[PDB]
Structure 1
Amino acid sequence: ADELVFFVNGKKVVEKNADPETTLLAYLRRKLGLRGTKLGCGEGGCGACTVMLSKYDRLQDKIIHFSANACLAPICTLHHVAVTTVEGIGSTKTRLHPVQERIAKSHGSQCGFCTPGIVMSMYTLLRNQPEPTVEEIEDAFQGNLCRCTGYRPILQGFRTFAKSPSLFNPEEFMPLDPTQEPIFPPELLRLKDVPPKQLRFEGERVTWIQASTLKELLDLKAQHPEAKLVVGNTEIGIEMKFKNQLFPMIICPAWIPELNAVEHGPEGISFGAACALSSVEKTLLEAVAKLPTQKTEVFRGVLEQLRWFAGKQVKSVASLGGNIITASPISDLNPVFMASGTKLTIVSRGTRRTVPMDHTFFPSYRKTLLGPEEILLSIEIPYSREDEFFSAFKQASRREDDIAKVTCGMRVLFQPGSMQVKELALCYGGMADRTISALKTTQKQLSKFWNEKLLQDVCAGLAEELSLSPDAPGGMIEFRRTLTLSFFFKFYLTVLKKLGKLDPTYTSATLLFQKHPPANIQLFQEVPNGQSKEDTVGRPLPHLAAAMQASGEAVYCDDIPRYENELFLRLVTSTRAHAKIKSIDVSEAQKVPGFVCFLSADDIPGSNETGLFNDETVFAKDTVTCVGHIIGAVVADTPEHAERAAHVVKVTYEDLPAIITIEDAIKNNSFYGSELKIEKGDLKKGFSEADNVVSGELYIGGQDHFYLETHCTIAIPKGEEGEMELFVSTQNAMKTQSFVAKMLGVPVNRILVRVKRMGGGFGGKETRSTLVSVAVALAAYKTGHPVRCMLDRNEDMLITGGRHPFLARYKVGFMKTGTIVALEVDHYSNAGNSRDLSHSIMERALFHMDNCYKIPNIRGTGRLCKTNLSSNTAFRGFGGPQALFIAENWMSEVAVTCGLPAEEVRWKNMYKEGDLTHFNQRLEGFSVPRCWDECLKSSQYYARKSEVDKFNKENCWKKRGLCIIPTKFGISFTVPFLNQAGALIHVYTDGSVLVSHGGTEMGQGLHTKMVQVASKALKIPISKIYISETSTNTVPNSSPTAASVSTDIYGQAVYEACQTILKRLEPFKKKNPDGSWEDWVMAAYQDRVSLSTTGFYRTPNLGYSFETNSGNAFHYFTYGVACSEVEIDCLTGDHKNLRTDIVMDVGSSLNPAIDIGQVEGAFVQGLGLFTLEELHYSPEGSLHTRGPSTYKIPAFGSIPTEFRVSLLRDCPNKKAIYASKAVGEPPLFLGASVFFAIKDAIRAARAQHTNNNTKELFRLDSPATPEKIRNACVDKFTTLCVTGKPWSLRV
């Protein structure tokens, strides 16, 4: 037992002391040194940790290959398994695998942090199917997330495995050759022969027994009834890591043949309880293909639930019995097994029973009826009989890889040849603390016939029997009740169809989700015909690091090796929203092995006062002012020890009155600073002149950054004069450097901050990274050891702040033609517990409240609400998206009120070339009308509007919507002094050039663009130029990499440094005009001419004043238009993003591959902001949603199915570097086209079932999630379910 023997990339691993608590991810990264596999979440959602596993399947007589999340795989399940990581398939030092080459060349890698796990999901698919279909390729990634790319390029690059200039050329792609793939390790193949034996592993806290036979298993369960079974670990992993469970003994029965046997009997197909869900899916797909339809009703319900379940990684290791016994109230399988009476065979040493699953099998929350010495041996999923029909339905927040809001299995059995109910079972998840059956309701229908009255009676019965109190866990009370009826309705209609083997307007409600095929078109401008091949400005050059990202060679902060004496820090944070800290007791933490120290405010040698506005503590002292407020930190010898000791630090609090919401803040006058305001013209006059006045209120929820790499710092104390060198995932080396200095109380010249790259920043690393950096620095200072900390996702989401939620009160005056005449908007943001960037964020909101519309009388105000929540910060858009959204909302209301088509109303209000904005800045080179016209045409908007009306006429329970919206976004930091940039350039004597500049790489391709710029300027190939990193000792006093201006400003500084070099070289060039760059550089060097210089740029003519409402706030504006169409399911709240067309003005792109990627990536973040992503807080201000399981960003399947992007031709922008425009943030608001398309669809649903009032204005807040969409589709079912028999009623 003792030894664990597996393979990694072909090489044998013998672990003599396997600890059962060690995951494969930890093992690869910390013991084997293979850092290409990443931690993104630790909970099975992001797929950044994906690896392939290969083993001999004795039982099938073949080597199988499947994917798995290394973060959830115990190394103790892997005895005699061969692991392949991203490093096992290729590298830039040898040769890229085709999978890696294509994702890199097709621009499917930006920050690169998700790239190895997506490479491994695609690689795994190819090892199983060397020639996949397009559909197989999409499904390969249900468990992979990417925050940067918008998914399109990954799918489009990989689709070349199936079967305008171009962004890439698939003709250069190496075809796949399966004969060159690494051989399954021959040593494993020899061992397949030996029969397995029980193994025992012993760790610090846990003993693991790998059971080889059923008899062994049954005896171990008799001997140790407390032992916890583990098969795939995809539940126990979570319990151990997130719910602080410790199971001192584990038995893993995964080897046992009886628990893996598949048997086709006369009543159904039996699966061993350890069979993975992917094996279940495979076997049932085969059965559905081979057997009559009438036999496979239950199977197709199982399959339908497995479709929208988890990625391939989870399905390949998650066992069928694991799901049954976990017995979550929202299991998608248990309602199906309950409604079908699926047969459970349950054993004990010398005992054995088979029972149908029914309502009694789940006695209470997360328990089943098995006793402590019983195991589930097998599950027989039954054949469907004649006259027997079955449906399963599931509705979550996102289709792919999400927790059901409501999920169900529904079965009816009729008398033979009849419509007379003999058996009826409606079993639901999400409606109690367990899977439940609606027995009261279904009992009443036995002997009734399938007709309208039965539908009405079942709906009424469900409305009564499946009550939810106001306080039900999960919330969303009305939505959930409505779904229980809505799913019955789909069942009722589906069963009518199946019995008539009626009403073409109803048939789509019965239809199972169907993928339309993707179509993607990118249109951009060719470079002039004779432009040098070496001048790559304007060409689609791939991100310089994409190949190393695809290979797992690109080094992110936590990939840097640890020093032998390096320690680990874990933050200790408030569990209360607002409280005095009474005492802190570390006496239990001190007992954890490897504990080094607990650090708190008294340990700081310099200042505890920190934050952009000096209104924060480094460590809370006396009081905490939010859940997640950092109180202290534990330092220990391993991250597990540090985390364990931090968990057991005991804080005693005394609560104070908390102010949580924007409403609490307004009521309590709890604000930062005073009101901001822009006002132009005469409001009283404008309102008195308006034909029509609408007023309202509107809310838009916040947004978590979800960078795939969470916050991370390594701090190295040098031991001399206070010196410290820090490697940090931050967009702001300068504030990191000065905040670390201020905390230590040393001069800023002592502190060196280095940033190689970030795996995403999106604004969330603009300032908030210092929360981690200053604590780690403290630890390095106090111990004199290197120290590091990388946040787990749940710490990151809680602590580091997000986008600002906004509440708006507005009043708009307009004429009956739709011309806007007066507008008043009062903005409130939820700022959290410090100022941070909240003020400048409100300023930018006010600057964008016009969007693209000329409004003669206008007043916008903004207040920052001060609350007991984590401080909110920059997030791509920086206040612009909130204000632009409020603006499109009233505009959409203007069009509805006037009864005019919305595009007419938008067009007639649009600024024209030369107009002044409400802040008196002139719009020069205003390209919105060109973007607008070209998007109308290329999207076929007009023809498509008629098609949408037709679809709507012909479908009662599905509706389509279509909407085209413009945007403009001002380019510059709104703080004038931030608009400066430095560069440092050296030419070495071989003529190679090292460029350094103040900007950071977070996936946006800044360094790529800077090398393209220096190469054009110097007239040398890019291969001679290199950027290693960003550091405070090469370029000092840098602005954070932010406001989308980094290319503009660093591009100028780089340009200037090159001009200086060119001038120093010119005499040598003159002497030897036929010589090489190398000749001139050597001659300059031998002549003692300096080949090093700085370059600098400061943006001219900027300086807006709120007091005078004049002076340029921005250098110019970036513009674009998006048209999107959606189809909503009015019965569930689900929707498809059918098609989106974008036309973006980015001037003369420096790199149209990178600029289109920025358009698509921003657009998709916008789409998530407005339709998917929602953070939930308890009323006491504790965040519920702390990982990808509950916080849902766009998935691969989320993007528009037809996705077209064009960069506007012939629009040089003379205000920036080589006529280009900033691109990073401007396109994000365009994702609101999906939100307004959705609202168009909702209006069509409401006309169908709710109202005759075609000028009705209903409130739709953001995000428009399935909850908000379904609740707005008011109909006979919502009417039965909306919350709220009295003795008397007035009247």
Structure 2
Amino acid sequence: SVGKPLPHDSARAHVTGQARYLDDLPCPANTLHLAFGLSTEASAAITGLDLEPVRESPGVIAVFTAADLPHDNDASPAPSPEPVLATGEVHFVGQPIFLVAATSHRAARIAARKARITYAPRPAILTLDQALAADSRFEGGPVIWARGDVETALAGAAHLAEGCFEIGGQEHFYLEGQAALALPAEGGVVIHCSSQHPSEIQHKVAHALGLAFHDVRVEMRRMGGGFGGKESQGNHLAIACAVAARATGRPCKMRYDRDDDMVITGKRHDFRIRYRIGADASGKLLGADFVHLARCGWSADLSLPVCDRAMLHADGSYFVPALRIESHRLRTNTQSNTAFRGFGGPQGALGMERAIEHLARGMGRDPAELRALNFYDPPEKKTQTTHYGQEVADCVLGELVTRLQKSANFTTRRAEIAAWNSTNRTLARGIALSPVKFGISFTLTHLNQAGALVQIYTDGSVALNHGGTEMGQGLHAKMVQVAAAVLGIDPVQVRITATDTSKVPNTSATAASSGADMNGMAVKDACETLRGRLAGFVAAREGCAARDVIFDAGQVQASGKSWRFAEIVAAAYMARISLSATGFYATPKLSWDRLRGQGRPFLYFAYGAAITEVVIDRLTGENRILRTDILHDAGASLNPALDIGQIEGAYVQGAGWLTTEELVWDHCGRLMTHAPSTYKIPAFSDRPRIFNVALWDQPNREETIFRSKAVGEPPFLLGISAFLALHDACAACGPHWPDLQAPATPEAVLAAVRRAEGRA
């Protein structure tokens, strides 16, 4: 039923409160509960560790230290180790030093704080300048890519804008926290956990326990949100439970309390971006010189590919004849930053957007017009390439943006705001349009693979299993629709089973928006092997070619006769044909050199555009989004309803990142914003008062699952339009460049207002 706006696979179960998340699962009466004892120091040696008051705390059954760990003490997804429990020294405020196994979740939590720890404090590395000065970084020096000669182009540039601005991080704030459960099962363990990558959980747990991979099994049914934060951060808990279960003999369960969750786990890499951008007398871009200062935290984690995507997307939506990026992946004594919806992409894009906005303002030109002038060309000379040298033969932005501007009534609205602004002096309106060009595929190429397993039972019903994990993006229904489309049956016949490493092995993470893309094909492959078997069985029985056997609407047709689907399956069963099949997919055409900054890392791009309108308060900096208009390319969408949902959601998260969401550390590396009381994600009323989401409906050029496009991450970047419109609102305060900083909090907005006004 591909293309039909069907609901989410657990929509009713959600609504009835019958959907199980990890902590909802039933487990044996003797299930112990776990909690970490955290470092209160950003950079120190541990001189003394007295865990006596911890052991003597009520209900505590076991206490664990790095020394107690039977094998591996590494949780990082990177080739560089990251201790699960601190090894003689601590690297940030919140680093787990010890593990507590107690008979209740409260007991463990209480016991965790009764620690007696002495430190030998060392100098911390908290700001980017400190790291840059002390050379506290990863990859041994920066990564630099260049196309053409920026310095030459900028030297003879008819127009030029220089600048530099901060972009703050972002805490995921998935509603369900990090959580895992380990069940000892005769020589091996079974892990239930709230993770985006069950195959890596297996890997890390196996090494922790000194077991071969075939002794560890990860089941994962649904997550209460993930957003990238569960791509790796789950490792620490699953290891903790695996290790504690091995020692105590009992099942172990661990879930972070919200304050623990925000202190321990990483966030979105915050960036400082320096830019130099040059233009033509006509307005064509000559060159753009970028410098990325990225905060990676006390550990590698997934920083390497994160900053790689920041660079890859530093072109924005624009052809630049010469471009350079200098990428510093700096290490700081703060939380180890991780994956987050966009995966470094939104930072690189925003750098290009802030720059082109500044350039436009510098030459007194309409930013929309300038961007329009500088998009990549439509399909149908040799094709323009990106700065990393990939052909952009699918760029629809010229046409798309035009459509969106007319439907949103852009030109008229802009004028109407000009008038409104000139009648007001306390409140100012702002409107802006920002485009999206997001590449699709893991930049770590070999991860571009997926698997499926399909069962057809004698009653005609179907069990569908794949490697992708449901974190709320509607992946499961999409797969069901594919499976039902290929077999020629009603979706109701297809039941989704939980994600299981013993069912589909060697899976990648559910990330890079490739979940629907790759797994969709894997499902298709498995079903076509099944449909192929039944067609060939019918064909032989009825005497004819298998390609004449028609599977449609729960009915099979051959030789003018028609059976129900179930009637064929039972027959094929009686005939003795395998009604079980695997499916496998790997993304073709992908090849690039990470170091050289050259090649084709992506299969296709996902495009879109957003027009946002906002209002600001000149006295305080208070602000509201009044209306948004989005036109987004989901290819030939697999589920339009689900796809609208993803855009509405992603946009709000994107916008939220660049407004009320602000991470704050103290002078000691202590995160100050670690509760929902202090961290401010978009509330109900925060939604755009008018919200207009429409899909650009046009098939993919590349051969993807029913010519659809990955809609998972790209719409997150549409939140830039809000930050640009907030800047537009500042531009109508005075003649000066406002230099608005991200996130645009009330304080940040007031600052940029006063700058444009020229008030100290």
TM-score by length of 1: 0.56
Mapping of residues 801-812 of structure 1, within 5 Å? 801-812=266-277
Aligned to 2:525: 1056
1:709 aligns with 2:176: yes
Q: Would you say the 8 A contact 1:575–1:628 is kept in 2? A: yes
Task: Give 1:1186 shift.
Answer: 1.0
1:1032 partner amino acid: T
Q: Distance in 1 between matches of 2:598 and 2:356?
A: 26
- Equivalent position of 1:873 in the other structure: 338
Deviation of 1:1271 (Å): 2.3
Output the amino acid matched with 2:654.
Answer: G
**Does the Cα contact within 8 Å between 1:1053 and 1:1095 map onto a contact in 2?**
yes
Map Cα deviations across residues 1004-1057 of structure 1 (whole Å, 9 max, x no partner).
010100000000000011111111210100000100000001111000000000
**More off after superposition, 1100-1109 vs 1058-1067:** 1100-1109
CA distance in 1: counterparts of 2:410 and 2:757, whole angstroms: 34
Match of 2:115 in 1: 649
Aligned to 2:451: 982
Superposed displacement of residue 1111, structure 1: 2.4
SS of the counterpart of 2:627? strand
Which residue, out of 496, 506, 515, partners 1:1046?
515
* Match of residue 388 from structure 2: 919
Q: 1:607 to 1:1202 in 2, by over 3 A?
A: same
Q: Specify the alignment match of 2:555 in structure 1.
A: none
Q: Which residue of 1 aligns with 2:677?
A: 1189
| In structure 1, C-alpha distance between the alignment counterparts of 2:63 and 2:474, rounded to whole Å | 40
Q: Which has the higher contact order (CA 8 A, sep 6+)?
A: 2
Residues 740 and 751, structure 2, Cα contact 8 Å, conserved in 1:
no
Is the Cα contact below 8 Å between 2:455 and 2:464 reproduced in 1?
Answer: yes
* Residue 660 (structure 1) aligns with: 126
Asked whether the equivalents of residues 817 and 898 of structure 1 are also in contact (C-alpha less than 8 Å), the reply is no
Q: Contact between 2:610 and 2:718, CA under 8 Å: does it hold in 1?
A: yes
Q: Over aligned residues, Cα RMSD in angstroms?
A: 1.5
Q: Is the 8 A contact 1:959 1:1127 kept in 2?
A: yes
In structure 2, relative to structure 1, the CA distance for the partners of 1:1177 and 1:1138 (3 Å cut) is same
Q: How many equivalent residue pairs?
A: 735
Quick one: which amino acid aligns to residue 672 of structure 1? Answer: F
Amino acid at match of 1:949: A
* 2:284 corresponds to: 819
| Equivalent residue number for residue 1133 of structure 1 | 621
CA distance 1:821–1:1277, shift in 2 (3 Å) = closer
Does the 8 A contact of 1:1122 with 1:1143 survive in 2? Answer: yes
**Residue 1226 (structure 1) aligned with residue 693 (structure 2):** no
Answer yes or no: is the 8 Å Cα contact 2:637–2:697 preserved in 1: no
Aligned to 1:688: 155
Instruction: Select 1:855's aligned residue among 283, 299, 320.
Output: 320
Residue 754 of structure 2, aligned match among 1274, 1277, 1281:
1274
Q: Does the Cα contact within 8 Å between 2:652 and 2:682 map onto a contact in 1?
A: yes
The match for 1:741 is 206
Instruction: Give the structure 1 partner of residue 547 of structure 2.
Output: none
- 1:619 maps to which residue? 85
The yes-or-no answer on 1:1120 pairing with 2:600 is no
Number of the residue aligned with 1:381? none
Amino acid at match of 1:717: P
Whole-Å separation in 1 of the counterparts to 2:441 and 2:60: 47
Partner of residue 400, structure 2: 931
Residues 1161-1176 of structure 1 correspond to what in structure 2 (within 5 A)? Answer: 1161-1176=649-664
How many Å apart are 1:980 and its aligned residue? 0.4
User: Contact 1:816/1:898 (CA < 8 Å) preserved in 2?
Assistant: no
**For residue 150 of structure 2, what is the amino acid of its counterpart?**
L
Report the equivalent of 1:17. none
Given that 1:1069 and 1:1075 are in contact with CA atoms closer than 8 Å, whether structure 2 keeps it comes out as: no
Is 1:699 the counterpart of 2:166? The answer is yes
In the alignment, structure 1 residue 1066 sits paired with structure 2 residue 532: no
Counterpart in 2 of 1:1202?
Answer: 690
Whole-angstrom distance in 2 between the partners of 1:1179 and 1:912? 49
Alignment of 1:71-82 (within 5 A): none
**Structure 1: which amino acid aligns with 2:165?**
L
**Structure 2 letter corresponding to 1:1014:** A
Q: Of 90, 96, 107, which aligns to 1:630? A: 96
Given that residues 714 and 786 in structure 1 are in contact (C-alpha distance below 8 angstroms), is that contact kept between their aligned partners in structure 2? Answer: yes
Equivalent-residue separation in structure 2 for 1:1216 and 1:1196 (angstroms): 36
- Tell me how far apart the structure 1 counterparts of residues 80 and 362 of structure 2 sit (CA, whole Å): 48
Which residue does the alignment assign to 1:787? 252
Residue in structure 2 matched with residue 1258 of structure 1 by the alignment: 738
Q: Tell me how far apart the structure 2 counterparts of residues 767 and 610 of structure 1 sit (CA, whole Å).
A: 8
> Take 1:646 and 1:552, find their aligned partners in 2: how far apart are those partners?
32
**What's the counterpart of residue 243 of structure 1?**
none
Is the Cα contact below 8 Å between 2:63 and 2:98 reproduced in 1?
A: yes
Equivalent AA in structure 1 for residue 353 of structure 2: E
- Preserved contact between residue 678 and residue 1106 of structure 1 (Cα < 8 Å): no
| Mapping for residues 176-195 of structure 1, pairs under 5 Å | none
Q: Give 2:174's aligned amino acid.
A: Y
Which has the higher mean CA deviation after the structures are superposed, 764-773 or 1099-1108?
1099-1108
What secondary structure is seen at the aligned counterpart in 2 of 1:915? Answer: coil
Following the alignment from structure 2 to structure 1, what is the Cα–Cα distance between the partners of residues 300 and 84?
15
Q: Distance in 1 between matches of 2:517 and 2:755?
A: 53
Contact 1:818 1:898 (8 Å CA) reproduced: no
Residues 531-551 of structure 1 deviation map (CA, whole Å, 9 limit, x = unaligned): xxxxx2111101010110011
CA contact (8 A) 2:633 2:698 kept: no
Distance in 1, Cα, partners of 2:630 & 2:449: 31
Does residue 128 of structure 2 align to residue 669 of structure 1?
no
Any gaps of 5 or more consecutive residues in structure 2? 543-557
CA distance in 1, matches of 2:755, 2:228: 42
TM-score by length of 2: 0.95
Choose which of 949, 954, 959 in structure 1 pairs with 2:428. 959
| Per-residue deviation, 1:1278 | 10
Matching residue of 2:548: none
1:1014 aligns to what SS in structure 2? helix
Structure 2 equivalent of residue 521 of structure 1:
none
Contact 1:677–1:1106, Cα closer than 8 Å, also in 2 = no
Using the alignment, how far apart are the partners of 2:147 and 2:56 within structure 1?
65
- After superposition, the C-alpha distances for 1:49-72 in whole angstroms (9 at most, x for unaligned) are xxxxxxxxxxxxxxxxxxxxxxxx
Equivalent residue, structure 2, for 1:1157: 645
CA distance in 1, matches of 2:697, 2:55: 65
Q: Deviations over 1:784-809 (max 9, x none)?
A: 10010111111111111000000112
8 Å contact 2:143–2:595 — kept in the other structure? no
Structure 1 pair 1136–911 and aligned structure 2 pair: CA distance change class (3 A):
same
Task: Tell me by how many angstroms 1:1107 deviates.
Answer: 4.8
The change in CA–CA distance for 1:1060 and 1:597 in structure 2 (over 3 A counts) is same
Give the match for residue 576 of structure 2: 1088
Report the secondary structure of 1:891's partner residue: helix
Q: Percent identity?
A: 41
Note if contact 2:317-2:375 (Cα within 8 Å) is conserved in structure 1. Answer: yes
1:324-363: CA deviation from partner (whole Å, max 9, x where unpaired): xxxxxxxxxxxxxxxxxxxxxxxxxxxxxxxxxxxxxxxx
Could you say what secondary structure the match of 1:888 adopts? helix
Please state whether the residue corresponding to 2:97 is helix, strand or coil.
Answer: strand
Q: Distance in 1 between matches of 2:50 and 2:757?
A: 54
Residues 197 and 509 in structure 2, CA contact (< 8 A), matched pair in contact too: yes
1:646 alignment partner AA: A
By how many angstroms is 1:694 displaced? 2.3
Q: Deviations over 1:677-706 (max 9, x none)?
A: 221112232012202332221110000000
Matched, 1:1147 2:635: yes
Residue identity in the other structure for 2:66: A
2:52 matched to which residue of 1? Answer: 587
Does the 8 Å CA contact 1:695/1:810 hold for their aligned counterparts?
yes
The alpha-carbon deviation at position 1109 of structure 1 amounts to: 4.4
C-alpha distance in 1 between matches for 2:327 and 2:725: 28
Measured after TM superposition, the shift of residue 841 of structure 1 is 0.6
SS at 1:1083 equivalent: helix
Q: Give 1:639's aligned amino acid.
A: H
1:763 aligned to 2:223? Answer: no
Deviation at 1:1275, TM superposition (A): 8.7
Bigger radius of gyration, 1 or 2? 1
Q: Would you say the 8 A contact 2:3–2:638 is kept in 1?
A: yes
Q: How does 1:6-405 map to 2 (within 5 A)?
A: none
User: What's the offset of the Cα at 1:1080?
Assistant: 1.4
